[PDB]
């Protein structure tokens, strides 16, 4: 286990560890984490995507500890989360993540040190600081945080009027080095956020990254503005973004129409709440007759499918992130004025669509990425009060990521999929007692 | 003559609302005009070899009953542009079977269900009487028309009328159209007259004009500011033209793209200074029927920072469609806007949706103007920001030439007609501010 | 009389369009009115004293020509408002002056240019006839109508109608109101009946459920998201017994202001936890009649902030006006807004600009709503999603006293009057839709 | 001081490479002017009109402050005296040292900022000579004019918009090591490209009105100016105003400009405007005593805009006066209009009719300086030669007191410089073909 990790474990274990007794702490040399090599990043050439295993590329290493910097915070982790650019990183797509930290590298010698022969994976976190660098004054060794994944620079002036806009904007984890899927991990202070007290270490880490997303693209009106009557088209509705995405048109008096690809996810979208679920495999839809062209009766028939739901009505909101498959469906589908937000191409990026019915009709595609500080705040805000829940199917040990991300991979699991990094057993860091009871069921809802 | 009454007092500069009133009605009035029977004869013809001078008649028409809240209109000059092409060659399908229809709802819709169509989609003319409860209008007003009718009586369109499930061109999907002596409107179509132009100078600008002010200036397009950058394709068309002109009267930078020198010309004529041809360039943004080229993407990209001082655009103008928009998506800078109002070179889009996501850029749609837009756009003519873009004036007997002309894209600017107005160049009353722009004004002849 | 036989074609229940038009129109119509000899009668008297029993009169009116564009509607019910209270007491002006300016714009609006004044600015009923140009509603329709009036013939309504010049409220400042037997309408003030409620329920939501949803949840006014907290004047008020319904549906936090215990149980009963008595609490944000008290401001910011666990509201749900609007901006979050759309205490808002500038917040001035933003709020009326609040009905020759309730802030929710219908508990064509939400449409009865 | 001299040497010789920068040795002290902790008192009693700064404002040689991440150690040519600069020096409100004193608790690096000096200055103009760890963006040699607000970003507040951090510093006013003295110490996401066809006392000029007009006017965040626009701008040769009405002009709507006197009417006329009221002239009397207005004449101002537009009422109300003119301004403006305020100069208890607010659907937004987003684009539209500095008088750095004096007591028209570093006006245009198209706009301040 190693000592001085194992005396870091201890003291979080204990529960009346007190800030100066973690700046006091020893830090290890090394610590375990899922990593990329860089000379393999051709190891699946020539191959199709879903015949490319996560399980030969993720290596389980030591590895040494980077140099705290300016405004950042080093992390003891307890857990973390498979997300699907953790999927996308495994096997090099659309691009290897090892050009991300080589062009992130010439900045300045102290982005430099994100460009190593390996890649520290993970884009989630829940745990404890254990060391803050300079200019840092809001948080503190020993504070329980999560971390969202945005990581701005903001020496340009193009991020002060939303941080998204930075051209150096980048995600942790995926764009940079030192993830969440590590005994330890780097983060810049403005990416920390106090830990939901009512949930586990593995639950408080599983929304980050999904939720604020979803947040941003549905709730925001740097997205799609929801407001109380829409009905909302919400793809993949049991999946990662889908399973916060539905919390949100629920709670915000929206109608969810959610689609899904089988009755055991048909379950869970009305054990969230939603009534009106669309099976895409029980449809058979075929949006695409062949590689090149698409078939707009096929539109027509997701669309009277919604129809049969609302009474007649279009949906006032799409939210994308299949891509090429769906998204000609996505906007034929759309009421008059409404909008399609994406932040992703699963299926493939090249999208093709029908312009007539996005001028004529006067719509908008609205694209969204991540979330800035302020709404990954609000997003973990309502996570903390109770009105946005975790959605946990199930666990696996960081020596198991490899299996994680296949799970991931190909699309055999339902809402979020955990990895518990040094908590050593799940259902430990609750300090809510009562809150937690209060929301049991539904925190529990996508459990197996 | 009850007619040449009219133009007399027209003409005469100074007739009063009370002698509009007093004038007595013609029994009938000369107009362009569509045959119902004749709706089939360019069966089997390519779309090129059909020829409007065919298929358009010069009628004399009796005059329509007056609604409530229309106007009757003594029409001193039009337009022609695509929409009266289309029909008159009876494209994409003949206009009678709209006209027919919609007559079905009332005797109100069935008074343009008639067995000829008056067509034109533009006017500028002189208020002659106005139907029940009218109340901004009155006889001898000069006014020009937006051309989208709408009912309204769907809550829909009561954001924005654009939103409307019902909407009617006139002219087009209604009859007693703009190329003849006299037209019927309705009140809430009408425009004032800007008072620096001609007659056939103000019934130009019309629809385009208004479509690129909704889609680049308005906040229901793309919301323009001073210091924006602005990539415009076919900026010599008709969209094109206006686009040009309101982003440099708004303190932006028009980033031109055009097809050939003469076409460059006329931007520096309207003001810009940076200008791309494409054809000289020799973009090849599609590989083949199926994949597009980023290499060429790129490349345009790195030729606009030449004009920019390597700043990417804060809008793209759009409307060429499939040809240029995976282009025009790369492009855009991070956090920017592609407005979209048409797909001249096909409807299915590719893009890579990579760069949209990424860099939280959107892709708005655009379509038309609502009636406010229509009015802000014209007044923007009025105030001498926004010029006409005339290159040939035709005689209403001339007008199936005219409609050739355009079919057959003749000429780099606009078309326009005289319907009563005796020759070109009447109907200036500022002549002061029309001096000053005369240059700009004449920049497509 | 022709008027029987019109209601008794409604009673029935099951009357075609073709019998509705056959009927024969009565040559008058029983109507609540204003005179405009009496415009003066109130000289001399603070506005408490003004008693509205004594300018409502119940009248015989000849029935108005039916023009282009409009309907004539059979009107079961309808309710009081504020707008009712307003005109009965001549304040701020007469509405006399403003159906003077509204008949010179044509020979159709000098119809409304008469001597009396039919008020109401609500109905429920059933169409009777449609002028010129109307097809998307017929003879036998059951409708509600909201009341915004706009003749559209200039350009500046054409992106949000409710910016024409000409725009204005049906029954305030038109004539032939819906406190009467029969109303004129604009067939696009025309939406459909939820057929869960009462007549006298189904009347009660347009004015007042249009102006909240404009003003809190659109993006023409605040644009409520989930997680704003919202401070809520007068809650359990006509406005506010909808504003409240929208903070907890949309997932916002309210921050509900009342007066007495009993309102703060309706709230409860709402859904909601965050409630303030400002009677209990004695807030005088006003020393005297020229200045304020920012001791006071704080006060109230400090009793939210126990509601909150420190946080400020994002918007402030305005319309008290004077008395509150310093303490209103204060209160607000940096960025927030206060949207308002009333000023019943006093049209004259004093306030310190160093916290609206320096914390970058907005004042948003809101009016009624256009055609859209009714028909979406009646459209969560009909969807069961927001509920009527009704607390007390008067038939319609006790009208005077139904507004003097509400002039005196005696009331809670929403003040119904019956026009043709000839008791409670009619209309209803939704039984099942009606069972599942009993409870909370009957929230607020004495 | 010689290290200093090779300094200025090699900026005047126009050539000097990015490595000649990197490679000269810094000085060890620098000529500032400050306050002095233990004078801060020196004007108790007077009225604020008698506080003079020549008294309180010193020429001292100070050290150089430590480099630290994030920031630049910058070669000022050129400064300003704006009014933060004179309430400074006369220590009103309060002394600048409180806070300075506070803030300096944080941290060792706060603490830098915690000295028995202050230097003041809240603009710059100059030449980069050294970065701190992490920068990317700027290099010695950049030729740089500065934003002044200063944040630290750490809550999430300000992160779509930074003017709703709750923790602002004004550099030069809630920081030391100001712009008014040979060196400064600056963050560098307060940095900004000089404009070149513009001396170095013009490029720094504009500064933070110039921003907050943009932001108030232009952006999104304030009243999002669309060409076609008529605006009302409110002492329209003064600060705010006069950029305001450039914006108004450079972007395709019509500015009404309201001024006091004839003088201050031809100004505008040189800015480009035509339509011009002088509110002196017309005699409004907004305010019938000390607490009622009078409606009557909020009618007068809007008949006399009509006057100017054909008829038509203002999209949009600059505001900044407050008390006086802002009932109004309320009342004047268009159905569906906004009222953009910045400041309220002749009171801030607000006084207006809320019904002309609700019944035709207006708005108040509050706007506050400008985020770095903004800074940047306003200084973007002058270095396009959009928008013009817009200086009347410029004092040697040795003068400083007598500038602020000029500023405190409105002896000029425009904005007053300080050359630094400068040895003379004049200096630092390197694009002379902008600048002799924009001449006469350029000088339409002096003098
Ligand atoms: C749905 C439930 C609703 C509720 O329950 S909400 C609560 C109940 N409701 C209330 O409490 C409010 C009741 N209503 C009122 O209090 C009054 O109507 C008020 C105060 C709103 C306006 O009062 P006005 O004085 O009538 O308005 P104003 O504009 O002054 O009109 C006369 C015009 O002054 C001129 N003029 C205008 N602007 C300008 C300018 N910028 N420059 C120059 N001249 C200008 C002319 O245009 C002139 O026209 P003319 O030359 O005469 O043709
Ligand atoms: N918080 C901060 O850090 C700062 C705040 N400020 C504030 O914003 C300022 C305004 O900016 P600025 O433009 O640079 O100041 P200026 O002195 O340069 O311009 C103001 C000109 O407002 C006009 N004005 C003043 N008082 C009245 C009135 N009662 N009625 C109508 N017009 C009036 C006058 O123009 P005219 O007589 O010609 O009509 C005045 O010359 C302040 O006055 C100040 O309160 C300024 C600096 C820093
Ligand atoms: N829905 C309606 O009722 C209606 C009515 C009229 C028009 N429209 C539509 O909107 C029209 C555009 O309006 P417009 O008046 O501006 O037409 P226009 O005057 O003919 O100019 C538009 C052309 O866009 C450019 N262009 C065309 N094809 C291109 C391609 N493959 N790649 C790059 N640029 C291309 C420009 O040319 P260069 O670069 O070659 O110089 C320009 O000639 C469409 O053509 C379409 O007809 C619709
Ligand atoms: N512009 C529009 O479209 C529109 C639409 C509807 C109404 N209105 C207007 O808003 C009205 C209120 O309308 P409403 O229908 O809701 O009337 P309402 O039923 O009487 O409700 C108003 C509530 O405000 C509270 N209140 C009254 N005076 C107050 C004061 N001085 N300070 C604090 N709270 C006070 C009372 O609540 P508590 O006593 O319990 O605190 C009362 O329940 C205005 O006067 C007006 O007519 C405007
Ligand atoms: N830009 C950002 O900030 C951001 C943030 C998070 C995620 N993402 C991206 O968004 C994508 C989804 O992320 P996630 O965490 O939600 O992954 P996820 O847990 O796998 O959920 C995706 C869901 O999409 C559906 N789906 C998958 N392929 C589909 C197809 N061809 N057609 C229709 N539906 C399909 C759902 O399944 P069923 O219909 O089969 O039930 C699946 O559960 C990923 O590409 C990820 O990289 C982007
Ligand atoms: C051709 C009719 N039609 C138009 N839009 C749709 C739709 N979304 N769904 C189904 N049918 C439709």
Redesign the pocket.
């Given at each position: 286990e190693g000592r001085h990790m194992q005396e870091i474990l201890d003291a979080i274990l204990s529960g009346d560890a007190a800030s100066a007794d973690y700046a006091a702490l020893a830090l290890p040399e090394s610590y375990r984490a899922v990593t990329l090599h860089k000379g393999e990043e051709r190891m699946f050439d020539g191959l199709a995507s879903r015949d490319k295993d996560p399980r030969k590329s993720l290596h389980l290493d030591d590895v040494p500890l980077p140099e705290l910097g300016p405004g950042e915070a080093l992390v003891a982790v307890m857990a973390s989360s498979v997300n699907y650019n953790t999927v996308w990183s495994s096997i090099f797509e659309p691009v290897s993540t090892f050009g991300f930290l080589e062009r992130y590298g010439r900045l300045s010698p102290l982005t430099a040190r994100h460009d190593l022969p390996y890649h520290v994976l993970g884009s989630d976190l829940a745990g404890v600081v254990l060391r803050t660098g300079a200019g840092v004054n809001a948080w503190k060794p020993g504070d329980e945080v999560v971390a969202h994944c945005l990581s701005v620079e903001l020496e340009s002036p193009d991020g002060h009027n939303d941080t998204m806009m930075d051209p150096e904007q980048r995600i942790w984890g995926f764009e940079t080095n030192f993830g969440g899927l590590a005994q330890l991990a780097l983060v810049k202070t403005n990416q920390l956020l106090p830990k939901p007290k009512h949930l586990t270490w593995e639950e408080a880490a599983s929304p980050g990254l999904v939720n604020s997303t979803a947040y941003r693209q549905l709730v925001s009106r740097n997205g799609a503005g929801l407001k109380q009557g829409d009905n909302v088209l919400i793809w993949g509705a049991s999946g990662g973004l889908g399973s916060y995405a539905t919390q949100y048109a629920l709670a915000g008096g929206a109608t969810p129409i959610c689609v899904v690809s089988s009755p055991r996810k048909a379950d869970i979208c009305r054990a969230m709440g939603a009534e009106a679920i669309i099976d895409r495999s029980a449809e058979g839809y075929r949006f695409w007759k062949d590689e090149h062209h698409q078939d707009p009766r096929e539109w027509?028939r997701?669309?009277?499918k919604?129809?049969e739901f609302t009474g007649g009505e279009?949906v006032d909101i799409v939210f994308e992130h299949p891509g090429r498959e769906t998204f000609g469906a996505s906007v034929?589908?759309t009421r008059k004025g409404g909008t399609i937000v994406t932040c992703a191409s699963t299926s493939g990026y090249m999208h093709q669509y029908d312009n007539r019915y996005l001028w004529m009709s006067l719509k908008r595609i609205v694209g969204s990425h991540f979330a800035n500080y302020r709404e990954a705040f609000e997003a973990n805000r309502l996570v903390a009060k109770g009105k946005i829940h975790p959605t946990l199917s199930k666990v696996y040990a960081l020596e198991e990521t490899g299996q994680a991300a296949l799970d991931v991979h190909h699309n055999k699991h339902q809402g979020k999929v955990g990895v518990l990094c040094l908590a050593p057993r799940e259902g430990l860091g609750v300090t809510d007692p009562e809150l937690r009871s209060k929301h049991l069921t539904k925190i529990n809802a996508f459990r197996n």
């Open positions: 027509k997701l669309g009277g919604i129809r279009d034929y589908v």
